[PDB]
Design an enzyme around this catalytic site. Sequence first.
Site, PDB file in Angstrom:
ATOM      1  N   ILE A 143       0.861  -1.213   0.000  1.00  0.00           N
ATOM      2  CA  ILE A 143       0.000   0.000   0.000  1.00  0.00           C
ATOM      3  C   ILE A 143       0.892   1.257   0.000  1.00  0.00           C
ATOM      4  O   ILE A 143       1.819   1.351   0.814  1.00  0.00           O
ATOM      5  CB  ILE A 143      -0.929   0.070   1.282  1.00  0.00           C
ATOM      6  CG1 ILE A 143      -1.648  -1.268   1.530  1.00  0.00           C
ATOM      7  CG2 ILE A 143      -1.968   1.167   1.102  1.00  0.00           C
ATOM      8  CD1 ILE A 143      -2.884  -1.487   0.644  1.00  0.00           C
ATOM      9  N   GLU A 195      -2.764  -8.448   3.220  1.00  0.00           N
ATOM     10  CA  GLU A 195      -2.454  -9.687   3.940  1.00  0.00           C
ATOM     11  C   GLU A 195      -3.456 -10.815   3.708  1.00  0.00           C
ATOM     12  O   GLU A 195      -3.102 -11.999   3.789  1.00  0.00           O
ATOM     13  CB  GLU A 195      -2.353  -9.434   5.441  1.00  0.00           C
ATOM     14  CG  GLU A 195      -1.329  -8.374   5.847  1.00  0.00           C
ATOM     15  CD  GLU A 195       0.103  -8.773   5.541  1.00  0.00           C
ATOM     16  OE1 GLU A 195       0.328  -9.482   4.532  1.00  0.00           O
ATOM     17  OE2 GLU A 195       1.015  -8.340   6.284  1.00  0.00           O
ATOM     18  N   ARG A 211      -2.429 -12.263   0.386  1.00  0.00           N
ATOM     19  CA  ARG A 211      -1.221 -13.049   0.470  1.00  0.00           C
ATOM     20  C   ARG A 211      -1.456 -14.396   1.079  1.00  0.00           C
ATOM     21  O   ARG A 211      -0.709 -15.326   0.796  1.00  0.00           O
ATOM     22  CB  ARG A 211      -0.151 -12.321   1.284  1.00  0.00           C
ATOM     23  CG  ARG A 211       0.159 -10.932   0.795  1.00  0.00           C
ATOM     24  CD  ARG A 211       1.345 -10.375   1.545  1.00  0.00           C
ATOM     25  NE  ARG A 211       1.874  -9.168   0.918  1.00  0.00           N
ATOM     26  CZ  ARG A 211       2.025  -8.009   1.545  1.00  0.00           C
ATOM     27  NH1 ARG A 211       1.658  -7.899   2.804  1.00  0.00           N
ATOM     28  NH2 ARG A 211       2.696  -7.028   0.965  1.00  0.00           N
TER      29      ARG A 211
HETATM   30  N1  LIG Z   1       2.289  -0.724   3.921  1.00  0.00           N
HETATM   31  C1  LIG Z   1       2.248  -2.025   3.749  1.00  0.00           C
HETATM   32  N2  LIG Z   1       1.439  -2.519   2.780  1.00  0.00           N
HETATM   33  C2  LIG Z   1       1.470  -3.861   2.599  1.00  0.00           C
HETATM   34  N3  LIG Z   1       2.246  -4.760   3.264  1.00  0.00           N
HETATM   35  C3  LIG Z   1       3.105  -4.192   4.254  1.00  0.00           C
HETATM   36  C4  LIG Z   1       4.036  -4.759   5.202  1.00  0.00           C
HETATM   37  C5  LIG Z   1       4.444  -6.217   5.373  1.00  0.00           C
HETATM   38  O1  LIG Z   1       5.115  -6.634   6.635  1.00  0.00           O
HETATM   39  C6  LIG Z   1       5.937  -7.867   6.379  1.00  0.00           C
HETATM   40  C7  LIG Z   1       7.539  -7.709   6.496  1.00  0.00           C
HETATM   41  O2  LIG Z   1       8.211  -7.938   7.773  1.00  0.00           O
HETATM   42  C8  LIG Z   1       5.611  -8.187   4.857  1.00  0.00           C
HETATM   43  O3  LIG Z   1       4.390  -8.841   4.500  1.00  0.00           O
HETATM   44  C9  LIG Z   1       5.521  -6.762   4.333  1.00  0.00           C
HETATM   45  O4  LIG Z   1       5.021  -7.099   3.088  1.00  0.00           O
HETATM   46  N4  LIG Z   1       4.444  -3.786   6.045  1.00  0.00           N
HETATM   47  N5  LIG Z   1       3.804  -2.644   5.570  1.00  0.00           N
HETATM   48  C10 LIG Z   1       3.035  -2.856   4.523  1.00  0.00           C
END
Ligand SMILES: Nc1ncnc2c([C@@H]3O[C@H](CO)[C@@H](O)[C@H]3O)n[nH]c12
EC number: 3.2.2.22
Length: 246
Positions: free
Chosen positions: A71, A160, A163
């Site tokens: 994001i 998430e 994923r």
């Molecule tokens: N702003 C964001 N948007 C999507 N995913 C993440 C993450 C996720 O945190 C995990 C890494 O330690 C991994 O899934 C990374 O993809 N932190 N911030 C994010």
Amino acid sequence: DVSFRLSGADPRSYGMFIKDLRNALPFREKVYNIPLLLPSVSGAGRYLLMHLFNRDGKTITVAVDVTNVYIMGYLADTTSYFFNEPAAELASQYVFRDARRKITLPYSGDYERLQIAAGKPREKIPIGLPALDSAISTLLHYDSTAAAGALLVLIQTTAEAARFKYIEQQIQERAYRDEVPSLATISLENSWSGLSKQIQLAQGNNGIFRTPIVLVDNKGNRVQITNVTSKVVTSNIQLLLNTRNI
Ligand SMILES: Nc1ncnc2c([C@@H]3O[C@H](CO)[C@@H](O)[C@H]3O)n[nH]c12
């Protein structure tokens, strides 16, 4: 573009939105039958636009990097907000160019900064579809502390859940009541990168992991994933992060 409307969202339509989201991302190969996300894209085509509507029908457009599902920021009618981090500044070059104002949030978009900013660790923020609706509504008018909290809900219930099928299932369980994420899901969230690497490193090692990924997940504490027959591989993880980005 993918859309979702919380108004009249049961668990089926969420699942369907989440399948779309998964489907809008590009990949060339599948590694062990999971999509391998491209190592990079260039142009505005690196960016997926999610339209999210709350119950009263107010909408934010969110921008997702299709190479890692990250994001970047979003648009609330005429203002755009991006994270304070370089990728997010690059993104700003291709998306929401028509907004009448562009604000940079005081933080980057990673979890550790967002929790610090919000005052609660992820474990103590309810997620669900009611939360997401809340989150959308917060985002519609600027408050940098309130946004850290909503963004934490927002990432978890879209990116998430894309994923990991487990997390998409948790949120379906919470279509009408929120609840803090399980250790299992905090663990899955953190290990996407580790998992992604080992699943790729196992082509030409017989489906065996060079290093075993230990999840707390649902063995209460301390599971260990060591080869690709594991269910977190066969049935859980849905999108792989390319090793060029790890
Ligand atoms: N702003 C964001 N948007 C999507 N995913 C993440 C993450 C996720 O945190 C995990 C890494 O330690 C991994 O899934 C990374 O993809 N932190 N911030 C994010």
